[PDB]
Design an enzyme around this catalytic site. Structure first.
Site, PDB file in Angstrom:
ATOM      1  N   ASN A  57      31.067  54.371   5.451  1.00 30.58           N
ATOM      2  CA  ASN A  57      32.026  54.264   6.556  1.00 30.58           C
ATOM      3  C   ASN A  57      33.191  53.326   6.246  1.00 30.58           C
ATOM      4  O   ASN A  57      32.984  52.161   5.917  1.00 30.58           O
ATOM      5  CB  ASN A  57      31.295  53.790   7.816  1.00 30.58           C
ATOM      6  CG  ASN A  57      32.048  54.112   9.087  1.00 30.58           C
ATOM      7  OD1 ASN A  57      33.022  54.864   9.072  1.00 30.58           O
ATOM      8  ND2 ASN A  57      31.585  53.561  10.203  1.00 30.58           N
ATOM      9  N   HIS A  94      20.896  53.656  21.729  1.00 31.99           N
ATOM     10  CA  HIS A  94      21.867  52.606  22.000  1.00 31.99           C
ATOM     11  C   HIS A  94      22.197  52.583  23.487  1.00 31.99           C
ATOM     12  O   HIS A  94      22.755  53.545  24.016  1.00 31.99           O
ATOM     13  CB  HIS A  94      23.149  52.825  21.192  1.00 31.99           C
ATOM     14  CG  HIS A  94      23.000  52.549  19.729  1.00 31.99           C
ATOM     15  ND1 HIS A  94      24.061  52.186  18.928  1.00 31.99           N
ATOM     16  CD2 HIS A  94      21.913  52.588  18.920  1.00 31.99           C
ATOM     17  CE1 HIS A  94      23.636  52.010  17.689  1.00 31.99           C
ATOM     18  NE2 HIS A  94      22.336  52.251  17.657  1.00 31.99           N
ATOM     19  N   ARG A 149      18.078  49.720  22.335  1.00 28.50           N
ATOM     20  CA  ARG A 149      18.861  48.573  21.910  1.00 28.50           C
ATOM     21  C   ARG A 149      19.856  48.266  23.011  1.00 28.50           C
ATOM     22  O   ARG A 149      20.554  49.166  23.492  1.00 28.50           O
ATOM     23  CB  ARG A 149      19.616  48.873  20.624  1.00 28.50           C
ATOM     24  CG  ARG A 149      20.289  47.638  20.057  1.00 28.50           C
ATOM     25  CD  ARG A 149      21.213  47.999  18.927  1.00 28.50           C
ATOM     26  NE  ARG A 149      22.443  48.584  19.438  1.00 28.50           N
ATOM     27  CZ  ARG A 149      23.513  48.826  18.693  1.00 28.50           C
ATOM     28  NH1 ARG A 149      23.483  48.548  17.395  1.00 28.50           N
ATOM     29  NH2 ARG A 149      24.605  49.347  19.242  1.00 28.50           N
ATOM     30  N   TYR A 179      30.431  43.550  19.873  1.00 31.44           N
ATOM     31  CA  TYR A 179      29.798  44.660  19.175  1.00 31.44           C
ATOM     32  C   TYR A 179      28.981  45.562  20.097  1.00 31.44           C
ATOM     33  O   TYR A 179      28.246  45.087  20.968  1.00 31.44           O
ATOM     34  CB  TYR A 179      28.898  44.184  18.030  1.00 31.44           C
ATOM     35  CG  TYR A 179      28.071  45.332  17.509  1.00 31.44           C
ATOM     36  CD1 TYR A 179      28.667  46.355  16.783  1.00 31.44           C
ATOM     37  CD2 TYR A 179      26.711  45.427  17.790  1.00 31.44           C
ATOM     38  CE1 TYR A 179      27.933  47.433  16.323  1.00 31.44           C
ATOM     39  CE2 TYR A 179      25.960  46.503  17.334  1.00 31.44           C
ATOM     40  CZ  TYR A 179      26.583  47.504  16.599  1.00 31.44           C
ATOM     41  OH  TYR A 179      25.862  48.582  16.134  1.00 31.44           O
ATOM     42  N   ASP A 234      21.089  43.663  18.498  1.00 34.56           N
ATOM     43  CA  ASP A 234      21.818  43.501  17.234  1.00 34.56           C
ATOM     44  C   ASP A 234      22.811  42.351  17.380  1.00 34.56           C
ATOM     45  O   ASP A 234      23.763  42.440  18.161  1.00 34.56           O
ATOM     46  CB  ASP A 234      22.581  44.798  16.938  1.00 34.56           C
ATOM     47  CG  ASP A 234      23.065  44.901  15.493  1.00 34.56           C
ATOM     48  OD1 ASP A 234      23.058  43.888  14.748  1.00 34.56           O
ATOM     49  OD2 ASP A 234      23.467  46.022  15.107  1.00 34.56           O
ATOM     50  N   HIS A 258      24.554  41.282  14.917  1.00 31.69           N
ATOM     51  CA  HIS A 258      25.687  41.801  14.155  1.00 31.69           C
ATOM     52  C   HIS A 258      26.455  40.733  13.367  1.00 31.69           C
ATOM     53  O   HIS A 258      27.688  40.688  13.406  1.00 31.69           O
ATOM     54  CB  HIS A 258      26.630  42.621  15.050  1.00 31.69           C
ATOM     55  CG  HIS A 258      27.099  43.887  14.411  1.00 31.69           C
ATOM     56  ND1 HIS A 258      28.354  44.020  13.856  1.00 31.69           N
ATOM     57  CD2 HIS A 258      26.470  45.069  14.207  1.00 31.69           C
ATOM     58  CE1 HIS A 258      28.479  45.231  13.341  1.00 31.69           C
ATOM     59  NE2 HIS A 258      27.348  45.886  13.539  1.00 31.69           N
ATOM     60  N   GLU A 311      18.282  41.611  15.339  1.00 33.38           N
ATOM     61  CA  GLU A 311      18.770  42.232  14.107  1.00 33.38           C
ATOM     62  C   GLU A 311      20.034  41.549  13.555  1.00 33.38           C
ATOM     63  O   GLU A 311      20.895  41.122  14.323  1.00 33.38           O
ATOM     64  CB  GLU A 311      19.042  43.711  14.414  1.00 33.38           C
ATOM     65  CG  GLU A 311      19.753  44.493  13.350  1.00 33.38           C
ATOM     66  CD  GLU A 311      20.150  45.873  13.843  1.00 33.38           C
ATOM     67  OE1 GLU A 311      20.903  46.544  13.120  1.00 33.38           O
ATOM     68  OE2 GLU A 311      19.707  46.296  14.945  1.00 33.38           O
ATOM     69  N   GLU A 346      20.981  46.625   7.036  1.00 30.27           N
ATOM     70  CA  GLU A 346      21.872  47.781   7.024  1.00 30.27           C
ATOM     71  C   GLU A 346      23.049  47.639   6.038  1.00 30.27           C
ATOM     72  O   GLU A 346      23.566  48.652   5.539  1.00 30.27           O
ATOM     73  CB  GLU A 346      22.369  48.136   8.437  1.00 30.27           C
ATOM     74  CG  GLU A 346      23.510  47.280   8.946  1.00 30.27           C
ATOM     75  CD  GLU A 346      23.849  47.591  10.390  1.00 30.27           C
ATOM     76  OE1 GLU A 346      22.921  47.553  11.235  1.00 30.27           O
ATOM     77  OE2 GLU A 346      25.035  47.873  10.682  1.00 30.27           O
ATOM     78  N   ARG A 369      16.117  47.316   7.150  1.00 33.07           N
ATOM     79  CA  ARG A 369      16.995  48.292   7.813  1.00 33.07           C
ATOM     80  C   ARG A 369      17.794  49.178   6.854  1.00 33.07           C
ATOM     81  O   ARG A 369      18.490  50.094   7.286  1.00 33.07           O
ATOM     82  CB  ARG A 369      17.987  47.546   8.707  1.00 33.07           C
ATOM     83  CG  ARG A 369      17.349  46.709   9.805  1.00 33.07           C
ATOM     84  CD  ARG A 369      17.324  47.477  11.113  1.00 33.07           C
ATOM     85  NE  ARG A 369      18.666  47.770  11.616  1.00 33.07           N
ATOM     86  CZ  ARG A 369      19.038  48.940  12.135  1.00 33.07           C
ATOM     87  NH1 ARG A 369      18.174  49.945  12.205  1.00 33.07           N
ATOM     88  NH2 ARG A 369      20.280  49.109  12.587  1.00 33.07           N
ATOM     89  N   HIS A 395      18.566  52.084   9.400  1.00 38.72           N
ATOM     90  CA  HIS A 395      19.873  52.196  10.045  1.00 38.72           C
ATOM     91  C   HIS A 395      20.144  53.675  10.279  1.00 38.72           C
ATOM     92  O   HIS A 395      20.029  54.476   9.346  1.00 38.72           O
ATOM     93  CB  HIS A 395      20.938  51.629   9.099  1.00 38.72           C
ATOM     94  CG  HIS A 395      22.298  51.491   9.712  1.00 38.72           C
ATOM     95  ND1 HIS A 395      23.452  51.539   8.963  1.00 38.72           N
ATOM     96  CD2 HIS A 395      22.687  51.303  10.998  1.00 38.72           C
ATOM     97  CE1 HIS A 395      24.499  51.380   9.760  1.00 38.72           C
ATOM     98  NE2 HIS A 395      24.062  51.243  11.000  1.00 38.72           N
ATOM     99  N   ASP A 432      27.584  57.306  11.389  1.00 35.13           N
ATOM    100  CA  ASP A 432      28.263  57.377  10.091  1.00 35.13           C
ATOM    101  C   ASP A 432      27.346  57.653   8.899  1.00 35.13           C
ATOM    102  O   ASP A 432      27.800  57.640   7.753  1.00 35.13           O
ATOM    103  CB  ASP A 432      29.146  56.145   9.830  1.00 35.13           C
ATOM    104  CG  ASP A 432      28.397  54.840   9.968  1.00 35.13           C
ATOM    105  OD1 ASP A 432      28.124  54.421  11.117  1.00 35.13           O
ATOM    106  OD2 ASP A 432      28.102  54.215   8.920  1.00 35.13           O
ATOM    107  N   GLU A 468      16.307  54.389  14.147  1.00 29.44           N
ATOM    108  CA  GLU A 468      17.496  54.329  15.005  1.00 29.44           C
ATOM    109  C   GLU A 468      18.044  55.726  15.269  1.00 29.44           C
ATOM    110  O   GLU A 468      18.125  56.550  14.352  1.00 29.44           O
ATOM    111  CB  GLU A 468      18.566  53.461  14.341  1.00 29.44           C
ATOM    112  CG  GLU A 468      19.896  53.386  15.092  1.00 29.44           C
ATOM    113  CD  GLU A 468      20.813  52.322  14.512  1.00 29.44           C
ATOM    114  OE1 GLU A 468      20.618  51.933  13.338  1.00 29.44           O
ATOM    115  OE2 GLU A 468      21.725  51.862  15.231  1.00 29.44           O
ATOM    116  N   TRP A 524      32.369  40.820  11.398  1.00 30.50           N
ATOM    117  CA  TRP A 524      32.263  41.821  12.455  1.00 30.50           C
ATOM    118  C   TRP A 524      30.839  42.367  12.543  1.00 30.50           C
ATOM    119  O   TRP A 524      30.175  42.572  11.519  1.00 30.50           O
ATOM    120  CB  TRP A 524      33.264  42.967  12.266  1.00 30.50           C
ATOM    121  CG  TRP A 524      33.053  44.043  13.285  1.00 30.50           C
ATOM    122  CD1 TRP A 524      33.465  44.034  14.594  1.00 30.50           C
ATOM    123  CD2 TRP A 524      32.358  45.279  13.091  1.00 30.50           C
ATOM    124  NE1 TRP A 524      33.062  45.191  15.220  1.00 30.50           N
ATOM    125  CE2 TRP A 524      32.381  45.971  14.321  1.00 30.50           C
ATOM    126  CE3 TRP A 524      31.715  45.867  11.998  1.00 30.50           C
ATOM    127  CZ2 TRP A 524      31.794  47.228  14.482  1.00 30.50           C
ATOM    128  CZ3 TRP A 524      31.123  47.119  12.163  1.00 30.50           C
ATOM    129  CH2 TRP A 524      31.168  47.781  13.395  1.00 30.50           C
TER     130      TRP A 524
HETATM  131 NA    NA Z   1      23.048  45.683  12.831  1.00 26.48          NA
END
Ligand code: NA
Ligand SMILES: [Cl-]
Ligand SMILES: [Cl-]
Ligand code: NA
Ligand code: NA
Ligand code: NA
Lengths: 408, 408, 408, 408
Positions: free
Chosen positions: D42, D127, D152, D164, D216, D218, D242, D268, D289, D318, D322, D345, D408
């Site tokens: 991605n 999600h 999640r 996120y 997450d 993130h 996560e 991930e 992940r 993960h 994407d 997931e 991010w």
């Molecule tokens: Na994550």
């Protein structure tokens, strides 16, 4: 003269099912004095029977029964393939039988041979089980009346049909090897973790703080899950939390020990000091559960107990129905001598089993008292044993809700 | 009946000097059966005598002699002040005497009680010493003729008046506690390090590769100095290099072990498993030297030997003249049973000493044979012992060339 | 349809002695397609036979043979008592048979199923043995002519009647399980350590540097002794020095690895990744020797090989006569795929054994070539197998010169 | 014949944007049988496309497609420059395509080739996102109705414009690569840490204890900040927390693990077992992940999953939009076999994406069911793919309130 008298004249196994399967090894010396040792390995009984009958027994004939250490090393090293449940149970059976003979020859009960008594009686715990928390509490009440100072508590988990230590049908006796082929149980870790603390809270509410309260997790958690459970049950001050995680990888205990002060017990599935040397030396457990029958007998378990003592670890011998009264009698002798004794599990055998294995150990007011007869104080009635033929019974398996083969 | 018979009727010490000082503890049961244990602590003998006479002996009267383990813990924990040479020698004396009694009561030689024989005879080493390398070689030749398979070699260092294991005057018997007050020896590490390899080279040149060759460094080096010596003597393949460095700090062995493959022995100055647990578990030594008299007796040394066995470490009991034939007899029994036996030191006692302590162990062709009499097979002739009154004798001290009080 | 076809219709063991004992498990699906797996555990054969016949086989009926992973976990976790030689050999037999079936169902030789070939042929080593160094050298010459690129060398030790890998009588085939009850060998470590380097020196003198030269210490040394041997043989650049020390305590390898750059191999007596996880992760060995039959089959050994690969450790499967051609064929398939292949041991079976187990693997110019038939390429002729009844044979035991039961 | 048939005839990439960008590798054998593998990275898609088109694809022509292992090593080692997201995604694409071909050639769905099914279905999580906690709760309610057992949860942070897992505008589908060039988000750790526990508290209040709840982080915290968050959310018993911290330095997880019993997931952004070997072996995480497309495909991820299993770590692939349905289908097959499966997931692809990649995996009642078609069960409609040309889209970047370029 004594040497010729201690030469092994005969040796053989006896297989009997007076309520459940037992395998026993008998060794007879030229003097006529015999010894017996437990060789029962639940759900794999005939593997040990064959290991003994075909490979070990023939090598015992003519050996000096007095050479306990040499025989242990001869079988342990001489097998070439070392350790393991079938292997170490066969060795334990020989070892227990030879210590029985040595004690008889010395004219002493076994505990005297080991170094004499360290205590006047041996504290036990009973299995208190129920479908619901209330059912379990009723069993706790019952056993306290019998004089037990310590109880293991197990109750059903809501949303879970079957869990460890709880009978399929109330009142009935819990005997896990309940089917010819393995029964299949279903498991949910998350439901158990949410429910278990409620059981201990209820026990403390109804019974107070003096009672020793034990719980068997029975291999079902991961380390961080066991850490969570340990923390959650700290307010209830358990005597131990047992078998939190499968421990072939001994490092599995580390995260639990680092996160909780709930005392930890492990080891009923072990057979070698090499299964637990690191657990002990790193102070990752408080009680070692490996019993005589599966842990290579008296010779090996003295060494395990002594290693444990250097790190404040105490003995907590596995004592289910699937170790015979031969093991239990020897265990009570061992328990009577060993300085770092913790507790002895008591899961009472059937009357039929007690009849097949006459013994001189006594249960009084929640404790065992070692026998005073020379030997470990247990014998076997071969004629009565012959009335109960072997019946195959396997331990259950446990699957997760998605069907994953898990740990029972 | 057996309990009343095992009640301690009397207990007392005997002090005698048939060539050198020995202190012995005798325990007499109501049955008339007695046991004895060595309590000799060279150069501090009366400290142990008083520890026993004034503090331990009175507490033994009326106790059940069969409770070996309980008594060991009662004296070890009950002292409050734990471990130490005076403390553990007193405890060893009691323990040895109680094992003597237990074996007599069982009608077995001690090795049978411990688990039976693991070997048919017990390999020893002799002390081969000389002023010069040649003098030492003459002694090696002599002892090989006597059937010794193993020899410890020590020779004088040029530029050094006195060194360990070498008599002040040739031919005369080496007995280190040679003066009322400590003799004062002078030491040079650098001269020793340059000379020692020449001794082993000469032994190999004259005697070849089959002979086991041992050497006692006797505490005089620092770790990196011992590492250097270990490397320098690798071509001569020593059985062990003993007591390289003082080891109150057990980490002292680390640099030696990391730098040489010469096998290492240590422990004659130790009295507790806590003095050597780390040395063993870290695999920093190959042989543990702590003997019965100073290491808390049979009860404690079984535990030390068993810990050692997990790490391939073998027993190499200190066996000087200053441990009595009581210890030696018990040691030979122990040596006969223990799986991880390495070697037994033999420094022969005087005829007068052998007469005072009649015994049934035998020396034949370089090896000891355990006695077959019930007990550890040693006794004491109190009437003959009374003919040799105590005479104070202290161990020497060692100073560097500048006068620094060093390690003897 | 495929599921119903893969349902297990029948399963049973076959015991045969075409030169020596083999135990084989056969699994037959509803489709008629069968698979076989080796279940031979030398000197304890009937323990595995009973483990299978009485406890595992009945649970296999009706199961989906395609579920290899589930079956492995069902037997490994479901046994409750985990790991061990009898246990893991039974599991290996099932696993090997199920992979055989899967490959047949896929219409591919086994190596294709595993991920395809990583090499065009599989290098082997031969056993070159002799009474004297010269006898051994003659055997090396012989095998080089046959095209072997690698040889294991073993020769008798002067002053020692019997040593590992050397036949009692010259010319005769070495088959260690040579007696109904264990033969008793005598051992001297010191004599071996002085002699062994001379063998490798002679091999290098006569054969030069290109030949791969292996040596099996066969469990007889302590760690510092193995360190010494490793250093002494560095100039001869051995392919590996195998089984230096008993390794139930995996830390036993540490001192050897810290002191020598001679490559190390271990693992023929192991049955679990848990026996060697630490040896691998700490980089204490170069080759892992645990074979398919004893190490839980393909499913488990893929995981062991993969763990090894993270630390540059290569496979060196134990390949004695006491693993059947079923194991050898499966091993050659595995060897053909696995990236971190090291070498394959070759101890040729008797013609009678080869006849009982027809197979499509080939030996050419010192190497194995994987078969191309679907399955692992091995089968069993049940009619021919029935002509050779089981005959009990045990592995020898080894004692030191003093009688101490040692490691064979 | 089979070899000539498995020779690679053609290989090429397909780039399509049916809702978002996907890159797919197709490999066609001489037999006509093809395989496909996901190559989508991605926001860097064309780097992988070029790596494949210019450097890997030409080397594939003429190779034996059956040699999966050799090809993996050829590309991994042969690249010279090892590991990395572009590198390992290209290798994964080849590997996935070759496993697809192998399964087709074997006539089996992929899970059968891997060792058969370990479970009857594959648990997923959805999600659930919202601007406010209440918005998120509405989404949780919605997904529970769809049968999800696990969710999640992510919600906006007060005082923070963008966070996120929360769409810029309500109702709209969250697809992070939302701009040609990176969008720029603003972040405040302190505001998030004060708010996040309120979300989980609300989820537990409205939905109770049975629901699995994931979160997450993130990459936005430091270790001691993540430790604080872990402790704060312990009462809500999260399934996992996560990506707490960026973990190029794997030691970053240590402080979190030492301070909380909230389960941890990471990986991930990883592409190599070397990114996580230490995290696993030190037991610093509970779920790994790293997915097939980015982790080097089936060949590599089997090894990662197996290493994880030694330390009780479970898989948690993960599964964002994407990664294409090619990866998801292969993942569901992998998930069906792997013993230590944790969760899968599920971020549903667009209908347009599902049309471009026809597949036989099914979603039912919160779980995936593996396809039964030979291969991984996914294909690509090249004609339909050609209707959706590539459109550049980058992932956002995150800055602190002072402008510091953050994670991010
Ligand atoms: Na994550
Ligand atoms: Cl003191
Ligand atoms: Cl076993
Ligand atoms: Na348990
Ligand atoms: Na010394
Ligand atoms: Na070997």
């Amino acid at each position: 003269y004594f040497q010729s008298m201690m030469k092994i004249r005969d040796a053989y196994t006896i297989v009997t099912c007076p309520g459940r399967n037992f395998v026993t090894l008998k060794i007879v010396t030229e003097s006529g004095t015999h010894g017996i040792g437990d060789a029962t390995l639940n759900g794999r009984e005939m593997a040990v029977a064959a290991y003994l009958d075909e490979h070990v027994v023939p090598a015992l004939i003519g050996r000096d029964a007095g050479r306990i250490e040499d025989t242990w090393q001869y079988l342990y090293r001489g097998a070439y393939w070392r350790r393991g449940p079938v292997t170490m149970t066969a060795i334990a059976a020989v070892d227990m039988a030879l210590w029985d003979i040595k004690a008889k020859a010395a004219g002493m009960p076994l505990y005297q041979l080991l170094g004499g008594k360290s205590r006047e009686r041996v504290m036990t715990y009973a299995h208190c089980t129920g479908q619901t928390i209330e059912d379990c509490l009723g069993e706790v009440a019952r056993h306290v009346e019998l004089g037990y100072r310590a109880v293991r508590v197990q109750s059903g988990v809501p949303g879970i049909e079957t869990t460890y230590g709880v009978a399929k049908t109330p009142g009935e006796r819990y005997e896990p090897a309940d089917s010819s082929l393995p029964a299949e149980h279903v498991w949910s870790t998350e439901k158990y973790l949410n429910h278990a603390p409620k059981l201990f809270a209820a026990v403390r509410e109804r019974f107070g703080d003096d009672l020793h309260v034990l719980h068997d997790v029975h291999h079902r958690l991961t380390p961080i899950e066991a850490a969570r459970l340990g923390k959650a049950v700290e307010p209830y001050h358990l005597f131990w939390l047992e078998d939190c995680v499968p421990a072939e990888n001994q490092e599995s205990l580390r995260l639990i020990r680092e996160h909780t002060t709930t005392p930890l017990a492990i080891g009923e599935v072990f057979n070698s000091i090499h299964d637990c040397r690191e657990l002990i030396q790193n102070q990752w457990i408080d009680y070692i559960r490996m019993p005589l029958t599966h842990g290579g007998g008296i010779t090996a378990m003295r060494r395990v107990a002594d290693l444990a003592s250097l790190y404040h670890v105490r003995t907590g011998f596995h004592g289910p129905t699937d170790l015979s009264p031969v093991c239990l009698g020897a265990a009570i002798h061992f328990d009577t001598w060993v300085p770092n004794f913790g507790i002895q599990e008591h899961m009472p055998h059937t009357d039929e089993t007690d009849a097949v294995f006459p013994h001189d150990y006594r249960f009084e007011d929640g404790h065992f008292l070692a026998g005073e007869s020379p030997g470990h104080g247990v014998d076997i009635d071969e004629e009565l044993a012959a009335k109960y033929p072997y019946e195959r019974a396997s331990l259950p398996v446990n699957r997760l809700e998605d069907g994953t083969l898990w740990h029972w």
